[PDB]
Design a protein around this nucleic acid. Sequence first.
RNA 1: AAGGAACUCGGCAAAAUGACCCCGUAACUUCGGGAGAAGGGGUGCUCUGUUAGGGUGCAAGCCCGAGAGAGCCGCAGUGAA
RNA 2: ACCUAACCAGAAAGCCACGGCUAACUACGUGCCAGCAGCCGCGGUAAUACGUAGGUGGCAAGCGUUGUCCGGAAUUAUUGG
RNA 3: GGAGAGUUUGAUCCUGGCUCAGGACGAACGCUGGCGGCGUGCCUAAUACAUGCAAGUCGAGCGGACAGAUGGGAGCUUGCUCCCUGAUGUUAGCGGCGGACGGGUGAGUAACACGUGGGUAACCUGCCUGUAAGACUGGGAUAACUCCGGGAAACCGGGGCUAAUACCGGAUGGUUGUUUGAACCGCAUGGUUCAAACAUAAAAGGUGGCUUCGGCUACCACUUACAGAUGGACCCGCGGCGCAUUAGCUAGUUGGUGAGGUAACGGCUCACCAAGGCGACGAUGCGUAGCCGACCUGAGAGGGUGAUCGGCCACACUGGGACUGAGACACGGCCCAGACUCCUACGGGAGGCAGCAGUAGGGAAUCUUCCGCAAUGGACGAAAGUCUGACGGAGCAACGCCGCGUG
Lengths: 86, 86, 89, 122
Amino acid sequence: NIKSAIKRTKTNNERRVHNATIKSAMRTAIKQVEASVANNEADKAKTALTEAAKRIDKAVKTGLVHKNTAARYKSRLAKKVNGLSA
Amino acid sequence: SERNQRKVYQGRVVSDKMDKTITVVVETYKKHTLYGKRVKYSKKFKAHDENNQAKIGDIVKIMETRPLSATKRFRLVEVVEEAVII
Amino acid sequence: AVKIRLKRMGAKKSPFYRIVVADSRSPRDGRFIETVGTYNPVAKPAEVKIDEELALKWLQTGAKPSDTVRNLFSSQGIMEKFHNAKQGK
Amino acid sequence: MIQQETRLKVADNSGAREVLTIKVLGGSGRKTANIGDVIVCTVKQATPGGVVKKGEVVKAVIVRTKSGARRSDGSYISFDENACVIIRDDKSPRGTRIFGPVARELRENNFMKIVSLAPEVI
RNA sequence: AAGGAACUCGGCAAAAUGACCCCGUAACUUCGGGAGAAGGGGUGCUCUGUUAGGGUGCAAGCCCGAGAGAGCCGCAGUGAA
RNA sequence: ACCUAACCAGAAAGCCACGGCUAACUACGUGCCAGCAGCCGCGGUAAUACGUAGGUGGCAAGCGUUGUCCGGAAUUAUUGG
RNA sequence: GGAGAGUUUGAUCCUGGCUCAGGACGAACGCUGGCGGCGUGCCUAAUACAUGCAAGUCGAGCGGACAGAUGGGAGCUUGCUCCCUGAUGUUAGCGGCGGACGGGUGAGUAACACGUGGGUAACCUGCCUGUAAGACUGGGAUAACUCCGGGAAACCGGGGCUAAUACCGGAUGGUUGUUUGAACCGCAUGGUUCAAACAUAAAAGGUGGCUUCGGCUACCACUUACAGAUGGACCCGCGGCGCAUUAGCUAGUUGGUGAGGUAACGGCUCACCAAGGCGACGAUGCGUAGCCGACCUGAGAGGGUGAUCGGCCACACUGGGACUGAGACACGGCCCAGACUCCUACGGGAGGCAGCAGUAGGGAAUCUUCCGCAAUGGACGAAAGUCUGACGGAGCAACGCCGCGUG
């Protein structure tokens, strides 16, 4: 019989929803720029690198990123995107 | 400005069949806390031969590197004494 | 941060603090950072001598007192004289 | 449709696992017993900690059959596994819970304790 | 159908199990077995895919093909004997 | 808490042991019966050993019994067989 | 700083065990029982639990909502109600922080778990110091609030409305990633520092006070970069246990390459390749057990225990799981399954005393269902304050230690 922070339970539900929206948006965007790096596309490679970059830093710069894992993901994605376009 | 003293004891070359990790353990001495008399013993160790240029049975001791594999901790230093074969 | 505050010690009839520097939220009679001081409440009355040579490094190295730590270290000429350390700001 | 020598798995926490029929109780007599019919039985297999043990002759009561229960209103109840609940000399059961769904025709017998102890009386 | 040896001197008889590949396999022993012990899982098709790799050939060409990933459809994939 | 005044000796002592190891002794009853006991062992009509009574001795708001651990244990020994 | 004595014999000495004198407890029991002070009191069943309190706080973040000094107008009662404004006080919800510290228990685990000693060119750190930059321009939401609904309850749903320190675009920012030019130094990995292009934020907050009413300013805030500090994470040397009537073990195992993953190396997890690796210096397997500072005993070496206080690890009805967050796989948070209890309108709901007491069981064996935030530490605060079964105290028990008495 939860005394205090049952409203912390409801805040964990709503915060879990909004945080799942931002984080899952980051994962789906990262698969999107990775898919654009799947084929040999030049202009979609750089602009999509800007898309997964901006959504990547906008996701890791607030909440569940946080810093080093974001640098790993953007680093490997920068290696593939720099590979497919030079 | 040096403070870290990551150092490894020099030991013989036990085996090099594990490819790129030629590991052998060197032997130190111990005192028996009840009886007193000196009793030595080995202490095995994998040694990550990066160039793979070790000789099995040639005394070459190297210093301890980071966690490099599953219980392979020491990096190579140099083949200090070559094996005498034939 | 490390709140340099008191810590109970003594018998059950009379408690006398010996206020060592401590962690952020350690146990009461438990782990402390680096003990400097001793100041009983009674006897006779309130006679306690503090460090002020490393305690200036503790109060200047990022810390704060409690209520009784602030009144005590402000009474022994260490909080004000440390403020004269900050008076060269 | 549960005649002599019909191994009925049990449906309670009384200790038992498989119940073997001996004689349906009604009359001279009969050879079938559909649903809600008291049988003299033994227990062939049991969970090891139990008051009713293997080789003990204690009566029982059907709950489910792969044979149908025929309600008098067109709809038919028919389960997929046979059943028993074990009774101690009155229609209060020896068991504690009664697992699984339960044919509702027991309530029209004198088994009103057995209905109350059982989750989906349909 | 539902129950399964209650039939019967007796599971008589029928029903059942079964092909490969793999896992796995006890007491006991004369050391070989037992042992196909036991008990389990996979298989149809399409594509990747003139697969890997072999046999044959100068190449062309056939044969012989494990292994896998994606996908299909059926109650059922040694669909039958 | 502590201090001061008054009052009353008024309310405030028991447990174990008394052959040895081990401080501490005699009588009555019992008569291999009831019993004790850590070991040695007592008890079968003169019991410093069983109960009872006086006395003694140890200790003390405590005293014995038992459980466990250490020492004695040079009876795991390196000191030290 | 160390004491021995008895006991084998008809007598003797060796050898050899067996017992006693001494100390100690988290003791219990037997008898008895004045007091004070200081500590101690579920060690057995981590057994199950009735009942009460154990984590709240922020009006100086927010939009309400109610009451309401004071003032307004009406009707009558010459004192009242009716409708407004409003200092003011209060709180349900949103949001921020705190529930990961504190408290308890040893169930587990014979290894990186503990102790010690290194290392981290392999980690991260909210709150707090100190530094220095910033805080520009906008958006649409939504609980509240109502109107209907379905529910026995627990509770859910749907339609309308709003705000913030809620969320979300853009500029700006390197330092936060990617490419190049270097410069210096290392421990293979490489590290430190300088430059140039692509991406990544801000509470315009609130409080006051002032002002020309444009704005100003201080304090408490928000972000970014740095170092500090406090914490944890990882790797490794060495140490601490009964058994060979346990000699075999191991196939993600041993190692490589590649990809993914986390704060991070790493078979951590997978694909592909190779056939490795551990063991008499005891692998594996059974057993037992939280470890340490230490405590007790011994002349000392040693032997035994891990109570109470502290340090670390573990666990939270049993077994998994992940979310919020800086940080948990979370003791009074959630989801699932199992067990056990309670409610039931049979459709479904509710719970976790190994927190403080307390009850039943177990047992030889262990207590009061008390007082208070006066201190110290926390939490939240601008502070005032609120919570604090931590703590500070108390009540019982000769339970231990010490002191005094019964002349």
